[PDB]
Design a protein around this motif. Structure first.
Motif, PDB file in Angstrom:
ATOM      1  N   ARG C   3       0.835  -1.193   0.000  1.00 55.47           N
ATOM      2  CA  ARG C   3       0.000   0.000   0.000  1.00 55.47           C
ATOM      3  C   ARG C   3       0.876   1.252   0.000  1.00 55.47           C
ATOM      4  NH1 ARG C   3      -2.579  -4.198   0.597  1.00 55.47           N
ATOM      5  NH2 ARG C   3      -4.858  -4.318   0.702  1.00 55.47           N
ATOM      6  N   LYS C   7       1.505   4.807  -4.573  1.00 56.17           N
ATOM      7  CA  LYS C   7       0.964   6.017  -3.976  1.00 56.17           C
ATOM      8  C   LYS C   7      -0.460   6.257  -4.475  1.00 56.17           C
ATOM      9  CE  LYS C   7       3.619   9.635  -4.192  1.00 56.17           C
ATOM     10  NZ  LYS C   7       4.527  10.576  -4.855  1.00 56.17           N
ATOM     11  N   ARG C   8      -0.646   6.252  -5.803  1.00 52.63           N
ATOM     12  CA  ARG C   8      -1.933   6.583  -6.396  1.00 52.63           C
ATOM     13  C   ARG C   8      -2.004   6.072  -7.834  1.00 52.63           C
ATOM     14  NH1 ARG C   8       0.711  11.167  -5.390  1.00 52.63           N
ATOM     15  NH2 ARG C   8       1.908  12.028  -7.139  1.00 52.63           N
ATOM     16  N   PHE C  26       0.686   3.868 -12.631  1.00 50.27           N
ATOM     17  CA  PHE C  26       0.552   4.240 -11.230  1.00 50.27           C
ATOM     18  C   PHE C  26       1.716   5.147 -10.841  1.00 50.27           C
ATOM     19  CE2 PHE C  26      -2.810   1.186 -10.277  1.00 50.27           C
ATOM     20  CZ  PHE C  26      -2.566   0.113 -11.104  1.00 50.27           C
ATOM     21  N   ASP C  27       1.493   6.000  -9.833  1.00 53.61           N
ATOM     22  CA  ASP C  27       2.570   6.727  -9.182  1.00 53.61           C
ATOM     23  C   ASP C  27       3.017   5.934  -7.957  1.00 53.61           C
ATOM     24  OD1 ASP C  27       3.205   8.874 -10.864  1.00 53.61           O
ATOM     25  OD2 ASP C  27       2.197  10.397  -9.631  1.00 53.61           O
TER      26      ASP C  27
ATOM     27  N   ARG D  29      -7.384   6.845  -0.859  1.00 57.07           N
ATOM     28  CA  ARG D  29      -6.433   7.583  -1.676  1.00 57.07           C
ATOM     29  C   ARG D  29      -6.713   7.347  -3.159  1.00 57.07           C
ATOM     30  NH1 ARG D  29      -3.073  10.200   1.290  1.00 57.07           N
ATOM     31  NH2 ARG D  29      -2.525   9.493   3.393  1.00 57.07           N
ATOM     32  N   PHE D  30      -7.033   6.099  -3.522  1.00 57.02           N
ATOM     33  CA  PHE D  30      -7.332   5.757  -4.903  1.00 57.02           C
ATOM     34  C   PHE D  30      -8.646   6.405  -5.334  1.00 57.02           C
ATOM     35  CE2 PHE D  30      -4.834   2.266  -7.189  1.00 57.02           C
ATOM     36  CZ  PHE D  30      -3.638   2.654  -6.627  1.00 57.02           C
ATOM     37  N   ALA D  33      -8.060  10.261  -6.094  1.00 61.41           N
ATOM     38  CA  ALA D  33      -7.371  10.504  -7.353  1.00 61.41           C
ATOM     39  C   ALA D  33      -8.339  10.368  -8.526  1.00 61.41           C
ATOM     40  CB  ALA D  33      -6.203   9.553  -7.491  1.00 61.41           C
ATOM     41  N   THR D  34      -9.219   9.362  -8.454  1.00 64.50           N
ATOM     42  CA  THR D  34     -10.223   9.127  -9.480  1.00 64.50           C
ATOM     43  C   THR D  34     -11.347  10.158  -9.369  1.00 64.50           C
ATOM     44  OG1 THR D  34     -11.174   7.546  -8.002  1.00 64.50           O
ATOM     45  CG2 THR D  34      -9.704   6.653  -9.684  1.00 64.50           C
TER      46      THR D  34
END
Ligand SMILES: [Mg+2]
Ligand SMILES: [Mg+2]
Ligand SMILES: [Mg+2]
Ligand SMILES: [Mg+2]
Ligand SMILES: [Mg+2]
Ligand SMILES: [Mg+2]
Ligand SMILES: [Mg+2]
Ligand SMILES: [Mg+2]
Ligand SMILES: [Mg+2]
Ligand SMILES: [Mg+2]
Ligand SMILES: [Mg+2]
Ligand SMILES: [Mg+2]
Ligand SMILES: [Mg+2]
Ligand SMILES: [Mg+2]
Ligand SMILES: [Mg+2]
Ligand SMILES: [Mg+2]
Ligand SMILES: [Mg+2]
Ligand SMILES: [Mg+2]
Ligand SMILES: [Mg+2]
Ligand SMILES: [Mg+2]
Ligand SMILES: [Mg+2]
Ligand SMILES: [Mg+2]
Ligand SMILES: [Mg+2]
Ligand SMILES: [Mg+2]
Ligand SMILES: [Mg+2]
Ligand SMILES: [Mg+2]
Ligand SMILES: [Mg+2]
Lengths: 61, 102, 89, 65
Positions: C3, C7-8, C26-27, D29-30, D33-34
């Motif tokens: 996780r 990062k995102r 992905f970052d 967090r995901f 971002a979306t």
RNA sequence: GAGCUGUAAGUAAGCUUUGAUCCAGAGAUUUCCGAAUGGGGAAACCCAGCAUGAGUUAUGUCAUGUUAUCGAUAUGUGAAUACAUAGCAUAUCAGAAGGCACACCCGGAGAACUGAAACAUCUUAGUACCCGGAGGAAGAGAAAGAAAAUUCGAUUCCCUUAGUAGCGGCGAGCGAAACGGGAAGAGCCCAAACCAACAAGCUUGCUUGUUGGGGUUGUAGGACACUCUAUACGGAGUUACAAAGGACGACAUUAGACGAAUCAUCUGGAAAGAUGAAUCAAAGAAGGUAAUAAUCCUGUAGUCGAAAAUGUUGUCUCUCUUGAGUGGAUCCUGAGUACGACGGAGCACGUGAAAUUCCGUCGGAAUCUGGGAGGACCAUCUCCUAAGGCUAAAUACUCUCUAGUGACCGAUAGUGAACCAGUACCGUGAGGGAAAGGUGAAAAGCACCCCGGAAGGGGAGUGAAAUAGAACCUGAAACCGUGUGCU
RNA sequence: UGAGUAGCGAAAGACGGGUGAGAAUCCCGUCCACCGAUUGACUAAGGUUUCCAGAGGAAGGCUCGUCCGCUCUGGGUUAGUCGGGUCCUAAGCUGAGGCCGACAGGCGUAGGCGAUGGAUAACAGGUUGAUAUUCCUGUACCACCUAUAAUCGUUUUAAUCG
RNA sequence: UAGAUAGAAAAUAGGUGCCCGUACCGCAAACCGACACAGGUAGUCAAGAUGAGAAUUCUAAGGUGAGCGAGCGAACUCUCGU
């Protein structure tokens, strides 16, 4: 970094004086001579001043 | 601030001097409070702003806490606030009457 | 740390085109290697990763008012899945 | 989760709770971002809980030593 | 004790009397670089060993711990070379490193411009710079002292002595000390003789080495001999004098709490102003509030308060510990030392008549009927007792903290820097180094209409004021325009 | 002030059609011209986002500007095989112990470090507004791992490592 | 070779292979020259006609028309032809 092992005698600084009393910095060095003596119960060569050596204060191996 | 939100306070200074109203909000950092019907300001509002209608809007603006004074319950007159500890709890006491303000 | 590793997600025009080819961008943390990313993706999304290509982006200067500063450095991993699929949304 | 409740949890329970809470953060967090996350304040709450969970766990380990 | 999520507005999502934010004490976490320390490296990166663990069919990958050097202490091996000594290997160590306060202290090393109206001695100056070692202070310190009285009694520092006595191309200039008045005060421990034990040389003579005791000086003292006194009774202590602790209390510091007394009228946008009538004061410091407020707010005087941490201190506890005489036979009382010569240096004192004190070289005492000093030197007399150490206070300084003060500055001033400044900028680098404050009481920061692509403007509105509209208080001069009376 | 003065940095443009508040200067087209051992194509330094799309026209652009290496907003750099590292060494640098030196430090042995050289396995085609021996496609190569192994060996060995 | 130790593997199948750089300008308006500056900037490639040639003239591939213009066609200055 040279001094008598026994006395710790080392070079000193002073002035050399002309007749006209002009001064130039000079050094007086100890009469250090490399001699084998017993250090820590093992024979070792170290610098010792002649003054220290005089009168057999320092044993020479 | 000695004045707290929901207190009924007389205005002792400014244009609105001699008016009594409830405290709508308090700003601790600025040492200012808002009192209903006091320091009404007319603010230009764009219809371009999120609110569809655009016109001059009249709302209360903050006044310095020093200018307002709490009203004594007994006399309905301006009173300073004194704090006396009762049963290990500090209570607001009107200087004029010596009764609990709230 | 899986996780922490990722990062995102990255959503862009080029990212979306890659997704049609089953490549997901992905970052990721700057320190992590590509192998770490592979294991991380597999754990989180329960998919099989064909390959991971990794790039580093330099800090980019961004100005606001009189203040001058740089954006954070970024490490971007493009992950191609041999088996399965990832739904970011 | 408040520290008092965390203190009730056993070491094993805390460890599992940290993992589960970390997963929640990753999901949040995901979502952000979306652009699917509206409740932004959730992120902060989860982080501080994980910090608390970690703090309480650390106290126990020091106490053991 | 009701708001809160910094600046920093705003939006969003939330938090909070089931006590947020916030404030103080304590604790947890604390990436990477950097002494930087596994190795390397162009700082903030790369590359490893070992152990253990995760993952994988397995390899790849990852996590945690550990791995520099030097020093010290051990342990085990151990060359040339018999013995064993290098050497080598391993373990342990809150051992060291590096930084800074552009200050103070001590020491090493040590200029020049300058002054001398030139300049070499001299001066600048043992200054600047550099380097080392610190400590909270440092350094100095219990007389081989100062003197010449009816002497004094460690050291340091202040006043004075005194610009004296002196020094000096006797030039420029340099320049004491003792006494006297004060601040502050505190004294101590060893070496040696001698005794006991142990070890070595084995006279196994009693001579060495180690440990413990003993002993510490000028009124010579001590050993030694002898006679009293005492086993902590007393006495002393972690600031020297030996060295760790514990318990309890007090005070202080690091959040806080309470804390007296004013209304009315006039002007004004607003009252604190003016006017009238009051009030408090152990509080008439100060700041703020719509103009200038002892009584509106924050405070002030006074009074009160600390869960926790820290500091200081007191009392017990604890630890340590005999103290005095008399005797003159013998012994001891710091040696390559003192001292001398030579070459230097330091002494206010430039080698001089040069005492006193240090260094290099060389030579080289005496021993209490001893030795040193009293400015060559000798005699006498007088005062001290070198060649081993430790020691508080009075003194210096200020990166910093807390509380304050100013016939100190007020934006070209005061810090370089009132402002996102050691920045922008400049330079290979060392380094150099700015400019730039003010809407309003409140943002009430100009809805709307008109011209214009916009900018900008004219209205309208907000406001006491917009001729307060954004580096928006006031708004000088230079300088640039427009109009006009006279020419 | 000088002053609406000097200058506006080697050059060939013309017209038509667009766009726009505005066009000698922007876009597109045709013609014309210029370079062509090069004004072309790569690429190492160095610079560091200047790259692409959309938007803008205050300032910067020696004029203009609807345009830009400018401003705003959002994007773009993909490697077992390419260059460097996990390989090697030169000059040089550093250097345990060591040698020397008022201090600071200087020098130096073993040992490290250090390419401009040595070693070293991928090519063609396609693809975006912006990447390509990096993506994709096709066809390869190298190192290592696991398993199954023709065969070979099986403790002085004689298979194997070295 | 000194040494080490039962195992070694032609093949076959499956699998594993890290970090850094990679944009863009790069004889230049993006580097070094305070400038969108007639200067400087290692190396690689480099077609046709002509020719000994990487000279010369004109072209190719590709790029470019140079970030002030319009007039007039005086002195004088520069550059050039007779
Ligand atoms: Mg890459
Ligand atoms: Mg609380
Ligand atoms: Mg390291
Ligand atoms: Mg002179
Ligand atoms: Mg002169
Ligand atoms: Mg001292
Ligand atoms: Mg002591
Ligand atoms: Mg009061
Ligand atoms: Mg009044
Ligand atoms: Mg002499
Ligand atoms: Mg005399
Ligand atoms: Mg200033
Ligand atoms: Mg001013
Ligand atoms: Mg200044
Ligand atoms: Mg002229
Ligand atoms: Mg002219
Ligand atoms: Mg002209
Ligand atoms: Mg031009
Ligand atoms: Mg222009
Ligand atoms: Mg471009
Ligand atoms: Mg060394
Ligand atoms: Mg060297
Ligand atoms: Mg090379
Ligand atoms: Mg390209
Ligand atoms: Mg490229
Ligand atoms: Mg050249
Ligand atoms: Mg040519």
């Amino acid at each position: 970094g040279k001094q008598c092992f026994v006395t710790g005698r080392k070079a000193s600084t002073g002035n050399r004086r002309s007749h006209a009393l002009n001064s130039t910095k000079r050094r007086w060095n100890a009469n250090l001579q490399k001699v084998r003596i017993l250090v820590d119960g093992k024979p070792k060569k170290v610098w010792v001043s002649a003054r220290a050596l005089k009168s057999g204060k320092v044993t020479r191996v | 601030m000695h004045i707290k939100k929901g207190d009924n306070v007389k205005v002792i200074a400014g244009k609105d001097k001699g008016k009594e109203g409830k405290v709508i909000a308090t700003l601790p950092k600025k040492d200012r409070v808002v009192v209903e019907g006091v320091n009404i300001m007319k603010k230009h509002q764009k219809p371009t702003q999120l609110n569809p209608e655009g016109g001059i809007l009249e709302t209360e603006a903050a006044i310095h806490v020093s200018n307002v004074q709490l009203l004594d319950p007994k006399t309905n007159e301006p009173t300073r606030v004194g704090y006396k500890f009762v049963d290990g709890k500090k209570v607001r006491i009107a200087k004029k009457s010596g009764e609990e303000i709230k | 740390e899986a996780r922490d590793i990722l990062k995102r997600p990255v959503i862009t025009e080029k990212s979306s085109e890659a997704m049609a080819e089953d490549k997901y961008t992905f970052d990721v943390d700057t320190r992590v290697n590509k192998t770490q990313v592979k294991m991380a993706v597999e754990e989180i999304f329960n998919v099989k990763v064909a390959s991971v290509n990794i790039m580093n982006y330099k800090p980019k200067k961004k100005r606001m008012g009189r203040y001058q500063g740089y954006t954070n450095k970024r490490r971007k991993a493009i992950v191609t899945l041999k088996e399965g699929s990832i739904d970011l949304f | 989760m408040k520290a008092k409740e965390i203190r009730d949890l056993t070491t094993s329970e805390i460890e599992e709770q940290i993992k589960s809470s970390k997963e929640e953060l990753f999901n949040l967090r995901f979502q952000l971002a979306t652009g699917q996350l509206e409740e932004t304040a959730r992120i902060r709450t989860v982080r501080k809980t994980i910090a608390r969970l970690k703090t309480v766990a650390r106290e126990r380990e020091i106490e053991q030593s």
